[PDB]
Design a protein around this nucleic acid. Structure first.
Ligand code: ZN
Lengths: 103, 143, 127, 67, 135, 78, 112, 37
RNA sequence: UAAUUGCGAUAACGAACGAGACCUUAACCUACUAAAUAGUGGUGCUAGCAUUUGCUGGUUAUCCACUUCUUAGAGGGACUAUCGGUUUCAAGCCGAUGGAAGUUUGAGGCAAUAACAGGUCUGUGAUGCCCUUAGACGUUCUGGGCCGCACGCGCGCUACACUGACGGAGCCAGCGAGUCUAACCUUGGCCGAGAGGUCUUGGUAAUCUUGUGAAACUCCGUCGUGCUGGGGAUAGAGCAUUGUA
């Protein structure tokens, strides 16, 4: 009997939501008790970059961006279900994390 | 329909409680008060040299009643003085912690504040009773 | 289950949530009365939803308000808008429809921001 | 100038040229009609074309056009 | 507060510690006039001599002037700690002093002539300074 | 071990970037298509999607060893 | 402004609002001048300023005159603002705004 | 120095990446930094 | 016409890439579909004050419901809509109205094209230069520099106050960032005028710092137009911190 918390972090929402809905429906279709995929605020990391490369012309400015989305799902299952689901769900772009403790 | 601190104006309540501490006379007052400025971001010491320690004990009591628990650092942030650095612009300077800490020890010794397990100075039950009573009085003077 | 109605109010990223339930008739912003606002000048603004429709409309409702974000002015506008909104919503769900609409008429006649939030969102600096 | 790019004007021209019947003065039905008769890759450009077929439909009910 | 009226009594220009003090300014900013004593020092000294500063400098007796001049020369015996003093922890004597109006300049010359007799960078730069800038 | 989350993920992006660069530069005559790095509990698996593996896996497997050590020696893996 | 209104009341004036409005009415220049070309040495054509800019220029001359008076004197701004608004409520040529209005209309008159 | 082009100059020493701005602008797309706005 | 953008006239008629546009973003959604790493209300456990219902809290799980506020989306949504001026009454322009949003609601990346002695590759080839090496272009080790001050030039910061300074109290944000094989962001308790010290602690973080209790600002006082209590240059003595210094 293991009560585990899972947290995903990704920049591409399609792969992240693919993995999220996969884990959701795969966790309920074999009867588990869970808290649905809770959605943390998409943090938008921006980088201010000067328009001027060569010292010609006045100084005006620009901006680069990244959107980082994070989800979390809570579950209760044995050791084998967690191992197998963690091995099966591995995807590129999406970063999965499995924590066992509840403190 | 009860008399409390959450009903009165601040400048009235602190006038009150200051007069209470000034006439009752039962507090713990240190000898540096007649010398000390309340913040490093200060140019001159307080104008009420003989009854401002009770003004700060009052402001503190009323500010600890209003929430869970606060430390001496939150009092440095509350006292919080804006300091000029000459040709340099104004900064936020934390105030003296001796005034705050000794205010807390002198209001704990007399039974108005109490150190709470969340490591923070919490308003005591007798502090609640007495502050709400003097709030009743401040509401009686207007009647 | 006391008949309650929750309505918010926004001004320049300052929000005020207003909980209008059925009580003896008490009006409080942040656990402090509406009589003692931080700005002493902007005071009357927070009064304007109480005066524009009569001072009796409140004898049946206890109104709560909590304000986060912004400064002092932003939150004054937030709480007066939250007050007006909470009033006309309690009057929509509980009192009849004509009372609620005479209330929104009374509100819109003087300040059309009492029912609609501020439409001057902070400009993107345009790089 | 909100001058509609040549794709919008040309598509409006053609859509009214063969499907004059089912289009009216209303954009809301010309839109879903532009969904059921045409295959436009974007919703925005489809709102563009269907809206310009709406304006043009308001211009053809008064007189004969160059089409 | 209280409109209390006194016929005469106050003088216009007084003098203490061989320095001129003008009597219609508050006592703090009347004592600030001299060298060696500023706003904050006159404030603390007039909190120590137990003189009411909200009462102007035209309302002060000579009995208060004797206490003030007393605290001038014994600031460590009236409980004004060593942090408050201009010349504290002197190298010449190992004590703490608060220097007055005509003595601050003599202490300055003592200091710069200390650095000149030793021949430090400060001395040479100071003297070559004054010399060449003045010439 | 232990780098801040954003810095961890960005440094993993830099890692994939640099190994993709090195593998495009090295296996140019082995029809190199791409790479995929899988982080596992014990070891790290750098899979080389290269459309001519008979050369990447040379005599006795040598050209793979020679590569791993490289991707080891500069990146300082145990 | 609330202080100023507290002063105009204790200045024996029953309606401070009508005092201010009459100041605004009295201090807005009817006709003005413009620096039109004319060929190098630019003469000044007498124009007739708009009611909008009349009110604008009025409030302007008022606030500016009052601030220009309340600078470096002990009087508070509300008292020279009430002072200005009352010397201009019923123009007395002791106010700044009536001065400047009369001079603008005078040079507008001389230049036609 | 910039761990790409032998350059003491331009260094973005932030986050421990240490690429000069010129090379970091190029490697930006391979690192993860893309043009949004 | 914003435009060689089109209508029209026409020994010219096609067709390509320019312009637009493709691309990435904003503000409304009490309607979806969804929450102890966000919050609200109700309920219990519980404190104080009034007591006549009431008021202000404590309880990171005592439970329940919500997303109205926060937040991942999906949709929608705008099409210059509608009306009127203006224009060959042709593509369009302009005013009003409605609209979350109607200057192209507003920002910028993507080409092909024809111009570049522009930067380096630590790419290569018996390739033309000076020599070839006691040269220091290599290393090091100390200590000085980069600020040194008649001045010219410029970006600024603080100011000449009384819509102000000082002294009392009120007390409201958002963008961030933060420690491993290390010492980062740091609550709180004691010592200290302060600066700081000391004993602990939470947080690798929507969980802790942190509600970043920010300042201008609000209010109650001191001063009163005096280079003043405006201004805080320059200079003296002390006390501590960062750092091998
Ligand atoms: Zn580089």
């Amino acid at each position: 009997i293991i009560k585990i918390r899972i947290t995903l972090t990704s920049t591409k929402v399609k792969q992240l939501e693919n993995v999220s809905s996969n884990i959701v429906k795969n966790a309920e279709q074999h009867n588990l008790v869970k808290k649905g995929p809770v959605r943390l605020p998409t943090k938008v990391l921006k980088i201010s970059t000067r328009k001027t490369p060569n010292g010609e012309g006045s100084k005006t400015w620009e901006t680069y961006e990244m959107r980082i989305h994070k989800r979390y799902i809570d579950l209760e299952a044995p050791v084998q279900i967690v191992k197998r689901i963690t091995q099966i769900t591995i995807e590129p772009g999406v970063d999965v994390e499995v924590v066992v403790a509840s403190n | 329909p009860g008399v409390s601190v959450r009903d009165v104006a601040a400048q009235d309540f602190i006038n009150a409680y200051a007069s209470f501490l000034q006439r009752q006379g039962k507090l713990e007052v240190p000898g540096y008060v007649d010398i000390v400025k309340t913040s490093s971001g200060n140019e001159m010491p307080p104008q009420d040299a003989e009854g401002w320690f009770y003004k700060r004990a009052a402001s503190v009591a009323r500010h600890i009643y209003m929430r869970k628990q606060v430390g001496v650092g939150k009092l440095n942030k509350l006292y919080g003085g804006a300091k000029s650095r000459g040709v340099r612009p104004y900064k936020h300077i934390d105030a003296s912690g001796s005034i705050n800490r000794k205010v807390l020890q002198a209001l704990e010794k007399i039974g108005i504040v109490e150190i709470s397990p969340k490591g923070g100075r919490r308003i005591s039950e007798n502090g609640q009773r007495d502050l709400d009573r003097i709030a009743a009085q401040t509401l009686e003077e207007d009647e | 289950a006391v008949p309650s109605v929750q309505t918010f109010g926004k001004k320049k990223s300052a929000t005020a949530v207003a909980h209008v339930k059925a009580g003896k008739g008490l009006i409080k912003v942040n656990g402090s009365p509406i009589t003692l606002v931080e700005p002493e000048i902007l005071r009357f603004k927070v009064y304007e939803p109480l005066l524009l429709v009569g001072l009796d409309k409140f004898s049946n409702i206890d109104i709560r308000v909590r304000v986060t974000g912004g400064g002092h002015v932003s939150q004054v506008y937030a709480i007066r808008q939250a007050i007006a909104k909470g009033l006309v919503a309690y009057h929509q769900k509980y009192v009849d429809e004509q009372s609620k609409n005479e209330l929104k008429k009374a509100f819109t006649s003087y300040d059309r921001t009492l029912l609609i939030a501020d439409s001057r969102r902070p400009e993107p600096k345009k790089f | 100038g909100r001058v509609r790019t040549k794709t919008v004007k040309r598509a409006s021209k053609a859509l009214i040229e063969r499907y004059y019947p089912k289009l009216t003065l209303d954009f809301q039905t010309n839109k879903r009609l532009c969904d059921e008769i045409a295959t436009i890759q974007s919703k925005r450009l489809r709102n563009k074309i269907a809206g310009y077929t709406t304006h043009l439909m308001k211009r053809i009910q008064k007189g004969p056009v160059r089409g | 507060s209280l409109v209390v009226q006194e016929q005469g009594s106050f003088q216009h220009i007084l003098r203490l510690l061989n320095t001129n003090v003008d009597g219609n300014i508050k006592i703090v900013y009347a004592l600030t006039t001299i060298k060696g004593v500023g706003r904050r020092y006159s404030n603390l000294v007039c909190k120590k001599a137990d003189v009411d500063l909200h009462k102007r400098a035209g309302e002060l007796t000579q009995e208060e002037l004797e206490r003030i001049v007393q605290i001038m020369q014994n600031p460590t015996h009236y409980k004004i700690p060593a942090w408050f003093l201009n010349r504290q922890n002197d190298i010449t004597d190992g004590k703490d002093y608060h220097t007055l109006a005509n003595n601050v300049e003599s202490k300055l010359r003592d200091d710069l002539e200390r650095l000149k007799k030793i021949r430090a960078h400060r001395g040479i730069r100071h003297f070559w300074g004054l010399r060449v800038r003045g010439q | 071990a232990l780098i801040s989350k954003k810095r961890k993920l960005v440094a993993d992006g830099v890692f994939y970037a640099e190994l993709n660069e090195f593998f495009t530069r090295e296996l140019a005559e082995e029809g190199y298509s791409g790479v995929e790095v899988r982080v596992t509990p014990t070891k790290t698996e750098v899979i080389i999607r290269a459309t001519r593996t008979q050369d990447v896996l040379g005599e006795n497997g040598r050209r793979i060893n020679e590569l791993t050590l490289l991707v080891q020696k500069r990146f300082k893996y145990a | 402004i609330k202080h100023t209104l507290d002063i105009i009341n204790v200045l024996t004036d029953q309606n401070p609002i009508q005092v201010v409005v009459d100041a605004i009415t009295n201090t807005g220049p009817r006709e003005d001048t413009t620096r039109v070309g004319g060929g190098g040495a630019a003469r000044r054509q007498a124009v007739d300023v708009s009611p909008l800019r009349r009110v604008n220029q009025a409030i302007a001359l008022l606030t500016i005159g009052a601030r220009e008076a309340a600078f470096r004197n002990i009087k508070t701004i509300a008292e020279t603002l009430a002072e200005e608004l009352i010397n201009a409520a019923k123009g007395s040529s002791t106010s700044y705004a009536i001065k400047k209005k009369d001079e603008l209309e005078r040079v507008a008159k001389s230049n036609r | 120095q910039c761990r790409v082009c032998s350059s003491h100059t331009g260094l973005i020493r932030k986050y421990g990446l240490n690429i000069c701005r010129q090379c970091f602008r190029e490697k930006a797309n391979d690192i993860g930094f893309n043009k949004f706005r």
